UniProtKB/Swiss-Prot annotation:
Tissues of expression: High levels in brain, pancreas, and skeletal muscle; less in colon, kidney, liver, stomach, and uterus; not expressed in placenta and spleen. Also detected in heart, prostate, lung, thymus, testis and ovary. Ubiquitously expressed in brain. Expressed by hematopoietic stem cells.
Gene coding for it: PTPRU
Subcellular location: Cell junction; Cell membrane
Protein name: Receptor-type tyrosine-protein phosphatase U
Post-translational modifications: The extracellular domain is proteolytically processed through cleavage within the fibronectin type-III 4 domain. In addition to the 190 kDa full-length protein, proteolytic products of 100 kDa, 80 kDa and 73 kDa are observed.
Subunit structure: Forms homooligomeric complexes which mediate cell homotypic adhesion. Interacts (via the cytoplasmic juxtamembrane domain) with CTNNB1; may mediate interaction with the cadherin/catenin adhesion complex. Interacts with KIT. May interact with AP3B1.
Residues annotated for substrate binding in this entry: 154, 222
Active-site residue numbers: 186
Mutation effect (residue 186 to S): Loss of phosphatase activity toward CTNNB1. Loss of the inhibitory effect on CTNNB1 transcriptional activity without effect on interaction with CTNNB1
């Protein structure tokens, strides 16, 4: 069953009784949608649609493009008319490469797509990069914004949800309703973002959240600590 927002704190504390048994049990209980691209003259990148609260195919989730998949990534962004990309990692976390840079520092061409970085907006916890894409044979630029969350701890969840919730609301505010899917890419962080984005809409519209069934439909949540964090984040968002 779904949980009333006004009962969410009761629910969490019940789920914490008996040394957190409720979360542990519910988490452990967990254990066609491919984005089509036309092949070109010459595998292609594996990406899947995920439904949102208000619309089908609200997200495309992909394992962040390896260097050989960078062109297919930008082709997909182009084909799908995606204007918001979400990334929830540093490129390097504690000296280990986690994502390879798939975007130009100024300008570059990937296959038949020319990409220009036209703005960088840097904040304490995230960066917004604006790109213009030009494609051979096409007369107009396609604009894409990358929302890059940099504040996620390398060792686990954020201690406070405040910053990630601010980031999620920025992406929500910046993505116009006629947009294509939000491409979320490059651990379980992607699943947390997806579940929060959907549940924040559900709480606003219905006054209820159904995290369990949202995660079960679901990129999967990698830790019990992440499963708990999703509840703590919705709790913080549901104040006032």
């Amino acid at each position: 069953p779904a949980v009333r927002v006004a009962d969410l704190l009761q629910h969490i504390n019940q789920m914490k009784t008996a040394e957190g048994y409720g979360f542990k049990q519910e988490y452990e209980s967990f254990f066609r949608h491919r984005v089509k691209l036309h092949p070109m003259l010459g595998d292609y990148i594996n990406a899947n649609y995920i439904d949102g609260y208000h619309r089908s195919n609200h997200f495309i989730a992909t394992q962040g493009p390896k260097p050989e998949m960078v062109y297919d990534f930008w082709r997909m962004v182009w084909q799908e008319h995606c204007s918001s990309i979400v990334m929830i990692t540093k490129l390097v976390e504690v000296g280990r490469v986690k994502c390879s840079r798939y975007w130009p520092e100024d300008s570059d061409t990937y296959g038949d797509i020319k990409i220009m970085l036209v703005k960088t907006e840097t904040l304490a916890e995230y960066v917004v990069r604006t790109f213009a894409l030009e494609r051979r044979g096409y007369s107009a630029r396609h604009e894409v914004r990358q929302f890059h969350f940099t504040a996620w701890p390398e060792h686990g969840v954020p201690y406070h949800a405040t910053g990630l919730l601010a980031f999620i609301r920025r992406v929500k505010a910046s993505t116009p309703p006629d947009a294509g899917p939000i491409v979320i890419h490059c651990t379980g962080r992607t699943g947390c973002y997806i579940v929060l984005d959907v549940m924040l809409d559900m709480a606003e519209c219905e006054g209820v959240v159904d995290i369990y069934n949202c995660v079960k439909t679901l990129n999967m949540i990698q830790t019990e600590e992440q499963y708990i964090f999703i509840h703590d984040a919705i709790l913080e968002a549901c104040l006032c």
